[PDB]
Amino acid sequence: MNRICELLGIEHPIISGGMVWCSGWKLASAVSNCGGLGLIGAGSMHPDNLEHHIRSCKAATDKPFGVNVPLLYPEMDKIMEIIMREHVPVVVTSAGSPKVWTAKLKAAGSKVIHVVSSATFARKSEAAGVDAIVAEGFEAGGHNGREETTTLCLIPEVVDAVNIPVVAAGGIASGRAVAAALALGADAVQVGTRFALSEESSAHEDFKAHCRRSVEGDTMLSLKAVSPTRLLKNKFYQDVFAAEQRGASVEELRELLGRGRAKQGIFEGDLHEGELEIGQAVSQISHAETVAEIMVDLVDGYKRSLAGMPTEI
Amino acid sequence: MNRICELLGIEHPIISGGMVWCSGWKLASAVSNCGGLGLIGAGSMHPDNLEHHIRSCKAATDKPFGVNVPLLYPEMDKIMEIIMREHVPVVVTSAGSPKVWTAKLKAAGSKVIHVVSSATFARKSEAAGVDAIVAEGFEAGGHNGREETTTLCLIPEVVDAVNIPVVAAGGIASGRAVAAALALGADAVQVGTRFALSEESSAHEDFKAHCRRSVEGDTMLSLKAVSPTRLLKNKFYQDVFAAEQRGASVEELRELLGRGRAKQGIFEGDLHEGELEIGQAVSQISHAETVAEIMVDLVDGYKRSLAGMPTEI
Ligand SMILES: Cc1cc2nc3c(=O)[nH]c(=O)nc-3n(C[C@H](O)[C@H](O)[C@H](O)COP(=O)(O)O)c2cc1C
Ligand SMILES: Cc1cc2nc3c(=O)[nH]c(=O)nc-3n(C[C@H](O)[C@H](O)[C@H](O)COP(=O)(O)O)c2cc1C
Ligand code: NA
Ligand code: NA
Ligand code: NA
Ligand code: NA
Ligand code: NA
Ligand code: NA
């Protein structure tokens, strides 16, 4: 068995990334039903709503699903209590220390996966007792690592650094890229952007449609002095860029960033003032599609990509 | 049959990228004698010196070789005359319009390849009549495209956009990355950083030893307001970073950049004031090695990568 398939009890080594405003039970349960692992994105859910999405996912699928928890989540104790009482099969943690919750989640029966952006942090997660890690490259949508290491340079270094399974994230929007990730030595892939634009994603339809119109170079890893974030170059980004060019302080950039822009953009469709988080691979997606269409494409595309490789060079 | 092998008449689809201060005839002839395509880097050579390196290369290998010419080269008429008279088999142009010289080089018997960093420019180069393109990602060493597209995101877009062969550059330092490039649909790879640190490279021993000590995150795409360039975060970089943080104008940044820092760093081993151009993949290289050793590792590493891949997912 592929190491991730066996670890998580899934048919295909494809995980849908936990994404604020996108990863409702509808997206997560559809990915799980298609044989991958769908993740609910707790980052955008108050505890009561999180519990509802877990229950709805549980009703909609008999297959494993998980919850992604950014560790800066403001009511952590409440959502951890929920996640352990609901026996969530897989928990994916990011943006914080894996030492805090890993042993407790594992004692409660969850498999634990932590998101990292370097070999050094991959090693610290392995030492913390996680079951696997996601190594996320520069091209990924949303908050990314300060080192700016791309998927192609990150994966071989991370898989040489640890003995536990490694999931590649950042730039995986096709069967070819799934093959490239397994060629580099990852056991599986985590797909964000392509699933964020799927029919089942909870993102606003105006957000999805706007993302489909974007072209190469429309995203930029930005706000680096506050927290590097990859987003579409919209009006909000332009304000940030003008501020950075004038030598704005961290406090000025923080004031401009303000609060709630990701919700306003991704969930509510404010394409001017929103923080439009999306990966570089957005430029590959041109029309609406369902989770099942994407899953079939990633699986069948992998097969064709691999079959067309020369036996040697 | 591999499209680049057949176009260029070489055994392995591996090209050493033209690199200022590194790609002398010793590096270029050694790569070509190992079955790839070694490029001479004309960017760092006055016209008489360039003629010397072409002639020493021809004396050292009976196999195909090429010359890399950045199109900002100050005495362009003199060096094209030399390249044409010597009938260089392959000419790789970068940093300028492929319309200026392509038709003339082809009329003189050279294969012409142009370096691009977007699918849009790939198409413009194809319209200009080039024989193939190199598509160079964000992680590459030296001057990169302003879109900051990574190799993983750039290759499948470029390959879908043109009918001519595509060589992937940026992040290729192992057989696993060669397998990744080919999985994305590239025909061949161009390897810069790993060859820049080889025994045969003309770069200063202190520069090579210094690159070997560096770790993930030690490079940064910088000077973006002037011309984006990926280099090691040395004292020069810190001066640039401090000036960008205070809102320096473009003229202030040009003044700081000055002239000849790339030669001082790469060729003369000035690790403090030099512009240490090198790719993110530098962190995978730990010790000195020859071109023959690199070529064998790339070829055998490719087969090992395939051995690790499941036929279907
Ligand atoms: C809109 C959006 C929201 C995201 N929110 C989160 C999140 O809440 N927690 C997290 O760990 N990663 C988050 N991510 C990162 C994704 O889980 C995933 O790792 C990334 O999107 C993968 O790269 P890709 O976009 O190139 O597919 C988000 C990504 C996007 C595009
Ligand atoms: C030290 C150095 C000098 C370079 N000089 C040139 C150059 O003169 N012309 C050019 O087209 N590219 C140049 N490059 C880019 C390389 O040709 C190549 O495309 C890049 O190194 C490939 O990415 P990699 O470093 O990750 O292998 C240089 C790269 C480096 C590291
Ligand atoms: Na991210
Ligand atoms: Na490993
Ligand atoms: Na599109
Ligand atoms: Na470059
Ligand atoms: Na093509
Ligand atoms: Na090293």
Coordinates of N, CA, C and O in Angstrom, one line a residue, chain B residues 42-178:
Chain B
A42 N 28.6 33.3 -22.3 CA 29.3 34.4 -22.9 C 29.1 35.7 -22.2 O 29.9 36.6 -22.3
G43 N 28.1 35.7 -21.2 CA 27.8 36.9 -20.5 C 29.0 37.5 -19.7 O 29.1 38.7 -19.6
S44 N 30.0 36.6 -19.3 CA 31.1 37.1 -18.6 C 32.4 37.2 -19.4 O 33.5 37.3 -18.8
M45 N 32.3 37.1 -20.8 CA 33.5 37.0 -21.6 C 33.5 38.2 -22.6 O 32.6 38.4 -23.4
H46 N 34.7 38.9 -22.6 CA 34.9 39.8 -23.8 C 35.0 39.0 -25.1 O 35.4 37.8 -25.0
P47 N 34.9 39.7 -26.2 CA 34.8 38.9 -27.5 C 36.0 38.0 -27.8 O 35.8 36.8 -28.1
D48 N 37.3 38.4 -27.5 CA 38.5 37.6 -27.8 C 38.5 36.4 -26.8 O 38.8 35.3 -27.2
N49 N 38.1 36.6 -25.6 CA 38.0 35.5 -24.6 C 37.0 34.5 -25.0 O 37.2 33.3 -24.9
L50 N 35.8 35.0 -25.5 CA 34.7 34.1 -25.9 C 35.2 33.2 -27.1 O 35.0 32.0 -27.1
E51 N 35.9 33.8 -28.1 CA 36.5 33.1 -29.2 C 37.5 32.0 -28.7 O 37.5 30.8 -29.2
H52 N 38.3 32.3 -27.7 CA 39.2 31.3 -27.0 C 38.4 30.2 -26.4 O 38.8 29.0 -26.6
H53 N 37.4 30.5 -25.6 CA 36.6 29.4 -25.0 C 35.9 28.6 -26.0 O 35.9 27.4 -25.8
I54 N 35.4 29.2 -27.1 CA 34.7 28.3 -28.1 C 35.7 27.3 -28.8 O 35.4 26.1 -29.0
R55 N 36.9 27.9 -29.1 CA 37.9 27.0 -29.7 C 38.4 25.9 -28.9 O 38.6 24.8 -29.3
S56 N 38.7 26.2 -27.6 CA 39.1 25.2 -26.6 C 38.1 24.1 -26.3 O 38.3 22.9 -26.2
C57 N 36.8 24.6 -26.3 CA 35.7 23.7 -26.2 C 35.7 22.7 -27.4 O 35.6 21.4 -27.2
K58 N 35.8 23.2 -28.6 CA 35.8 22.4 -29.8 C 36.9 21.4 -29.9 O 36.8 20.3 -30.4
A59 N 38.1 21.9 -29.3 CA 39.2 21.0 -29.3 C 39.1 19.9 -28.2 O 39.8 18.9 -28.3
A60 N 38.2 20.1 -27.2 CA 38.0 19.2 -26.1 C 36.9 18.2 -26.2 O 36.9 17.2 -25.6
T61 N 36.0 18.5 -27.1 CA 34.8 17.6 -27.4 C 34.5 17.6 -28.9 O 34.4 18.6 -29.5
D62 N 34.2 16.4 -29.3 CA 33.6 16.3 -30.7 C 32.1 16.2 -30.6 O 31.4 16.0 -31.7
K63 N 31.5 16.5 -29.5 CA 30.0 16.3 -29.3 C 29.4 17.8 -29.3 O 30.1 18.8 -29.3
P64 N 28.1 17.8 -29.4 CA 27.5 19.2 -29.6 C 27.7 20.0 -28.3 O 27.8 19.4 -27.2
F65 N 27.9 21.3 -28.5 CA 28.0 22.2 -27.3 C 27.3 23.5 -27.7 O 26.9 23.7 -28.9
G66 N 27.1 24.4 -26.8 CA 26.4 25.6 -27.1 C 27.0 26.8 -26.4 O 27.9 26.7 -25.6
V67 N 26.5 28.0 -26.8 CA 26.8 29.2 -26.1 C 25.6 29.9 -25.6 O 24.6 30.1 -26.4
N68 N 25.6 30.4 -24.4 CA 24.5 31.2 -23.8 C 24.9 32.6 -24.0 O 26.0 33.1 -23.6
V69 N 24.0 33.4 -24.6 CA 24.2 34.9 -24.7 C 23.0 35.7 -24.1 O 21.9 35.6 -24.6
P70 N 23.3 36.4 -22.9 CA 22.3 37.3 -22.5 C 22.2 38.5 -23.5 O 23.2 39.0 -23.8
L71 N 21.0 38.9 -23.9 CA 20.9 39.8 -25.1 C 21.3 41.2 -24.7 O 21.3 42.1 -25.6
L72 N 21.5 41.5 -23.4 CA 22.0 42.8 -23.0 C 23.6 42.9 -23.1 O 24.2 43.8 -22.6
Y73 N 24.1 41.9 -23.8 CA 25.6 41.8 -23.9 C 26.1 43.1 -24.6 O 25.5 43.5 -25.7
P74 N 27.1 43.8 -24.1 CA 27.5 45.1 -24.6 C 28.1 45.2 -26.1 O 27.9 46.2 -26.7
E75 N 28.8 44.1 -26.5 CA 29.4 44.2 -27.9 C 28.8 43.0 -28.7 O 29.4 42.1 -29.1
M76 N 27.5 43.2 -28.9 CA 26.7 42.1 -29.4 C 27.1 41.7 -30.8 O 27.1 40.5 -31.2
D77 N 27.4 42.7 -31.7 CA 27.8 42.4 -33.0 C 29.0 41.6 -33.1 O 29.1 40.7 -33.9
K78 N 30.0 41.9 -32.3 CA 31.3 41.2 -32.3 C 31.1 39.7 -31.9 O 31.5 38.8 -32.6
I79 N 30.3 39.5 -30.8 CA 30.1 38.1 -30.4 C 29.2 37.3 -31.3 O 29.5 36.1 -31.4
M80 N 28.2 37.9 -31.9 CA 27.5 37.1 -32.9 C 28.3 36.7 -34.1 O 28.2 35.7 -34.6
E81 N 29.2 37.7 -34.5 CA 30.1 37.3 -35.6 C 30.9 36.1 -35.3 O 31.1 35.2 -36.0
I82 N 31.5 36.1 -34.0 CA 32.3 35.0 -33.6 C 31.5 33.7 -33.5 O 31.9 32.7 -34.1
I83 N 30.3 33.8 -32.9 CA 29.4 32.6 -32.8 C 29.1 32.0 -34.2 O 29.2 30.8 -34.4
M84 N 28.7 32.9 -35.1 CA 28.4 32.4 -36.5 C 29.6 31.9 -37.2 O 29.5 30.8 -37.8
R85 N 30.7 32.5 -37.2 CA 32.0 32.0 -37.8 C 32.4 30.6 -37.3 O 32.8 29.8 -38.0
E86 N 32.3 30.5 -36.0 CA 32.7 29.2 -35.3 C 31.6 28.1 -35.5 O 31.8 27.0 -35.1
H87 N 30.4 28.5 -36.1 CA 29.3 27.5 -36.3 C 28.9 26.8 -35.0 O 28.9 25.6 -34.9
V88 N 28.6 27.6 -33.9 CA 28.3 27.0 -32.7 C 27.0 26.2 -32.9 O 26.1 26.7 -33.5
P89 N 27.0 24.9 -32.4 CA 25.8 24.1 -32.8 C 24.5 24.6 -32.2 O 23.4 24.6 -32.8
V90 N 24.5 25.1 -31.0 CA 23.3 25.6 -30.3 C 23.6 26.9 -29.6 O 24.6 27.1 -28.9
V91 N 22.7 27.9 -29.8 CA 22.8 29.2 -29.1 C 21.5 29.4 -28.3 O 20.4 29.2 -28.7
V92 N 21.8 29.7 -27.0 CA 20.7 29.9 -26.1 C 20.7 31.4 -25.7 O 21.7 31.9 -25.2
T93 N 19.6 32.1 -26.1 CA 19.5 33.5 -25.8 C 18.6 33.8 -24.6 O 17.7 33.0 -24.3
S94 N 18.9 34.8 -23.9 CA 18.1 35.2 -22.7 C 18.0 36.7 -22.5 O 18.9 37.4 -23.1
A95 N 17.1 37.2 -21.8 CA 17.1 38.6 -21.3 C 17.0 39.5 -22.5 O 17.8 40.5 -22.7
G96 N 16.0 39.4 -23.4 CA 15.9 40.2 -24.6 C 15.0 39.6 -25.6 O 14.3 38.6 -25.3
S97 N 14.8 40.2 -26.7 CA 13.8 39.8 -27.7 C 14.4 38.7 -28.5 O 15.4 38.8 -29.1
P98 N 13.7 37.5 -28.7 CA 14.2 36.5 -29.6 C 14.0 36.9 -31.1 O 14.5 36.1 -31.9
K99 N 13.4 38.0 -31.4 CA 13.2 38.4 -32.8 C 14.5 39.0 -33.4 O 14.7 39.0 -34.6
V100 N 15.4 39.5 -32.6 CA 16.5 40.2 -33.1 C 17.5 39.3 -33.8 O 17.9 39.6 -35.0
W101 N 17.8 38.1 -33.2 CA 18.9 37.3 -33.7 C 18.5 36.0 -34.2 O 19.2 35.3 -34.9
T102 N 17.3 35.5 -33.8 CA 16.9 34.1 -34.2 C 17.1 33.8 -35.7 O 17.8 32.8 -36.0
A103 N 16.5 34.6 -36.6 CA 16.5 34.2 -38.0 C 17.9 34.1 -38.5 O 18.3 33.1 -39.2
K104 N 18.8 35.0 -38.1 CA 20.2 35.0 -38.5 C 21.0 33.8 -38.0 O 21.8 33.2 -38.7
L105 N 20.9 33.5 -36.7 CA 21.5 32.3 -36.1 C 21.1 31.1 -36.9 O 21.9 30.2 -37.1
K106 N 19.8 30.9 -37.2 CA 19.3 29.7 -37.8 C 19.8 29.7 -39.3 O 20.2 28.6 -39.7
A107 N 19.9 30.8 -39.9 CA 20.4 30.9 -41.3 C 21.9 30.5 -41.2 O 22.4 29.9 -42.2
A108 N 22.6 30.8 -40.2 CA 24.0 30.4 -40.0 C 24.3 29.0 -39.5 O 25.4 28.6 -39.3
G109 N 23.2 28.2 -39.4 CA 23.3 26.8 -39.0 C 23.2 26.5 -37.5 O 23.4 25.3 -37.1
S110 N 22.9 27.4 -36.6 CA 22.7 27.1 -35.2 C 21.3 26.7 -34.8 O 20.4 27.3 -35.4
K111 N 21.1 25.9 -33.9 CA 19.8 25.7 -33.3 C 19.6 26.8 -32.2 O 20.6 27.2 -31.6
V112 N 18.4 27.4 -32.2 CA 18.2 28.6 -31.3 C 17.2 28.2 -30.2 O 16.1 27.7 -30.5
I113 N 17.6 28.5 -29.0 CA 16.7 28.3 -27.8 C 16.6 29.6 -27.0 O 17.7 30.2 -26.8
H114 N 15.5 30.0 -26.6 CA 15.3 31.2 -25.9 C 14.8 30.9 -24.5 O 14.0 30.0 -24.3
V115 N 15.3 31.6 -23.5 CA 14.9 31.4 -22.1 C 13.7 32.3 -21.8 O 13.7 33.5 -22.0
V116 N 12.6 31.7 -21.2 CA 11.4 32.4 -20.8 C 10.9 32.1 -19.4 O 11.3 31.1 -18.9
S117 N 10.1 32.9 -18.9 CA 9.6 32.7 -17.6 C 8.0 32.8 -17.5 O 7.4 32.9 -16.5
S118 N 7.3 32.7 -18.7 CA 5.9 32.7 -18.7 C 5.4 32.0 -20.0 O 6.2 31.9 -20.9
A119 N 4.2 31.5 -20.0 CA 3.6 30.9 -21.1 C 3.4 31.9 -22.3 O 3.6 31.6 -23.4
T120 N 3.1 33.1 -21.9 CA 2.9 34.2 -22.9 C 4.2 34.4 -23.6 O 4.2 34.5 -24.9
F121 N 5.4 34.6 -22.9 CA 6.6 34.7 -23.6 C 7.1 33.4 -24.3 O 7.8 33.5 -25.3
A122 N 6.7 32.3 -23.8 CA 7.0 31.0 -24.6 C 6.4 31.2 -25.9 O 7.0 30.8 -26.9
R123 N 5.1 31.6 -26.0 CA 4.4 31.7 -27.3 C 5.1 32.8 -28.2 O 5.2 32.6 -29.4
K124 N 5.6 33.8 -27.6 CA 6.2 34.9 -28.4 C 7.5 34.4 -29.0 O 7.8 34.6 -30.2
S125 N 8.2 33.6 -28.2 CA 9.5 33.0 -28.7 C 9.2 32.0 -29.8 O 9.9 31.9 -30.8
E126 N 8.1 31.1 -29.6 CA 7.7 30.2 -30.7 C 7.4 30.9 -32.0 O 7.8 30.5 -33.1
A127 N 6.7 32.1 -31.8 CA 6.3 32.9 -33.0 C 7.6 33.5 -33.7 O 7.5 33.8 -34.9
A128 N 8.6 33.7 -32.9 CA 9.9 34.3 -33.4 C 10.7 33.2 -34.2 O 11.7 33.5 -34.7
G129 N 10.2 31.9 -34.1 CA 10.9 30.9 -34.9 C 12.0 30.1 -34.2 O 12.8 29.4 -34.8
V130 N 12.1 30.2 -32.8 CA 13.1 29.5 -32.1 C 12.8 28.0 -32.2 O 11.7 27.6 -32.4
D131 N 13.9 27.2 -32.0 CA 13.8 25.7 -32.1 C 13.2 25.1 -30.8 O 12.6 24.0 -30.9
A132 N 13.4 25.7 -29.7 CA 13.0 25.2 -28.4 C 13.0 26.3 -27.4 O 13.6 27.4 -27.7
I133 N 12.4 26.2 -26.2 CA 12.6 27.2 -25.2 C 13.0 26.5 -23.9 O 12.7 25.3 -23.6
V134 N 13.7 27.3 -23.0 CA 13.9 26.9 -21.6 C 12.9 27.7 -20.8 O 12.8 28.9 -20.9
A135 N 12.2 27.0 -20.0 CA 11.2 27.7 -19.1 C 11.8 27.7 -17.7 O 12.0 26.6 -17.1
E136 N 12.1 28.9 -17.1 CA 12.9 29.0 -15.9 C 12.0 29.4 -14.7 O 11.4 30.5 -14.7
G137 N 12.0 28.6 -13.7 CA 11.1 28.9 -12.5 C 11.9 29.8 -11.5 O 13.1 30.0 -11.5
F138 N 11.1 30.3 -10.6 CA 11.4 31.2 -9.4 C 12.6 30.7 -8.6 O 13.4 31.5 -8.1
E139 N 12.7 29.3 -8.5 CA 13.7 28.8 -7.6 C 15.1 28.8 -8.3 O 16.2 28.5 -7.6
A140 N 15.2 29.1 -9.6 CA 16.5 29.1 -10.3 C 17.4 30.2 -9.7 O 17.0 31.2 -9.2
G141 N 18.7 30.0 -9.9 CA 19.7 31.0 -9.6 C 19.8 32.1 -10.6 O 19.3 31.9 -11.7
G142 N 20.2 33.3 -10.1 CA 20.4 34.4 -11.1 C 19.1 35.2 -11.4 O 18.2 35.3 -10.5
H143 N 19.1 35.9 -12.5 CA 18.0 36.8 -12.8 C 16.8 35.9 -13.2 O 16.9 35.1 -14.1
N144 N 15.6 36.2 -12.6 CA 14.4 35.4 -12.8 C 13.2 36.3 -13.3 O 13.3 37.5 -13.1
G145 N 12.1 35.7 -13.7 CA 11.0 36.4 -14.2 C 10.2 37.1 -13.0 O 10.2 36.6 -11.9
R146 N 9.6 38.3 -13.3 CA 8.9 39.1 -12.3 C 7.6 38.4 -11.9 O 7.0 38.8 -10.9
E147 N 7.1 37.4 -12.7 CA 5.8 36.8 -12.3 C 6.0 35.8 -11.0 O 5.1 35.4 -10.4
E148 N 7.3 35.5 -10.8 CA 7.7 34.6 -9.7 C 7.0 33.2 -9.8 O 6.9 32.5 -8.8
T149 N 6.7 32.8 -11.0 CA 6.1 31.4 -11.2 C 7.1 30.3 -10.9 O 8.2 30.3 -11.4
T150 N 6.7 29.3 -10.1 CA 7.7 28.2 -9.7 C 7.8 27.3 -10.9 O 6.9 27.2 -11.7
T151 N 8.8 26.4 -10.9 CA 8.9 25.4 -11.9 C 7.7 24.5 -12.0 O 7.1 24.3 -13.1
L152 N 7.2 24.1 -10.9 CA 6.0 23.2 -10.8 C 4.8 23.8 -11.5 O 4.0 23.1 -12.1
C153 N 4.6 25.1 -11.3 CA 3.5 25.8 -11.9 C 3.7 26.2 -13.3 O 2.8 26.3 -14.1
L154 N 5.0 26.5 -13.7 CA 5.3 27.1 -15.0 C 5.3 26.0 -16.1 O 4.8 26.1 -17.2
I155 N 6.0 24.8 -15.8 CA 6.1 23.8 -16.8 C 4.8 23.3 -17.5 O 4.7 23.4 -18.7
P156 N 3.8 22.9 -16.7 CA 2.6 22.4 -17.4 C 1.9 23.5 -18.2 O 1.4 23.2 -19.3
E157 N 2.0 24.8 -17.8 CA 1.4 25.8 -18.5 C 2.2 26.1 -19.8 O 1.6 26.4 -20.9
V158 N 3.5 26.1 -19.7 CA 4.3 26.4 -20.9 C 4.1 25.3 -21.9 O 4.0 25.5 -23.1
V159 N 4.2 24.0 -21.4 CA 4.1 22.9 -22.3 C 2.7 22.9 -23.0 O 2.6 22.4 -24.2
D160 N 1.7 23.3 -22.3 CA 0.3 23.3 -23.0 C 0.2 24.5 -24.0 O -0.7 24.4 -24.9
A161 N 1.1 25.4 -23.9 CA 1.0 26.7 -24.7 C 1.7 26.6 -26.0 O 1.5 27.3 -26.9
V162 N 2.7 25.7 -26.1 CA 3.5 25.7 -27.4 C 3.7 24.3 -27.9 O 3.5 23.3 -27.2
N163 N 4.0 24.2 -29.2 CA 4.3 22.9 -29.8 C 5.8 22.5 -29.9 O 6.1 21.4 -30.0
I164 N 6.6 23.5 -29.7 CA 8.1 23.2 -29.7 C 8.6 22.6 -28.4 O 7.9 22.7 -27.4
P165 N 9.8 21.9 -28.4 CA 10.2 21.3 -27.1 C 10.5 22.3 -26.1 O 10.9 23.5 -26.3
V166 N 10.4 21.9 -24.8 CA 10.5 22.7 -23.6 C 11.5 22.1 -22.7 O 11.4 20.9 -22.4
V167 N 12.5 22.9 -22.3 CA 13.5 22.5 -21.3 C 13.1 23.2 -20.0 O 13.0 24.4 -19.9
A168 N 13.0 22.4 -18.9 CA 12.7 23.0 -17.6 C 14.0 23.4 -16.9 O 15.0 22.6 -16.8
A169 N 14.0 24.6 -16.3 CA 15.2 25.1 -15.5 C 14.7 25.6 -14.2 O 13.6 26.3 -14.2
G170 N 15.5 25.4 -13.2 CA 15.1 26.0 -11.9 C 14.8 24.8 -10.9 O 13.7 24.2 -11.0
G171 N 15.7 24.6 -10.0 CA 15.4 23.5 -9.0 C 15.8 22.1 -9.4 O 15.6 21.2 -8.7
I172 N 16.5 22.0 -10.6 CA 16.8 20.6 -11.0 C 18.2 20.2 -10.6 O 19.2 20.6 -11.2
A173 N 18.3 19.5 -9.5 CA 19.7 19.1 -8.9 C 19.8 17.6 -8.5 O 20.7 17.2 -7.9
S174 N 18.8 16.8 -9.0 CA 18.8 15.4 -8.6 C 18.0 14.7 -9.7 O 17.2 15.4 -10.4
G175 N 18.2 13.4 -9.8 CA 17.3 12.6 -10.7 C 15.9 12.7 -10.4 O 15.0 12.6 -11.3
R176 N 15.5 12.8 -9.1 CA 14.1 12.9 -8.8 C 13.5 14.2 -9.4 O 12.3 14.2 -9.8
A177 N 14.3 15.3 -9.4 CA 13.7 16.5 -10.0 C 13.7 16.4 -11.5 O 12.8 17.0 -12.2
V178 N 14.7 15.7 -12.1 CA 14.6 15.4 -13.6 C 13.3 14.7 -13.9 O 12.6 15.0 -14.8

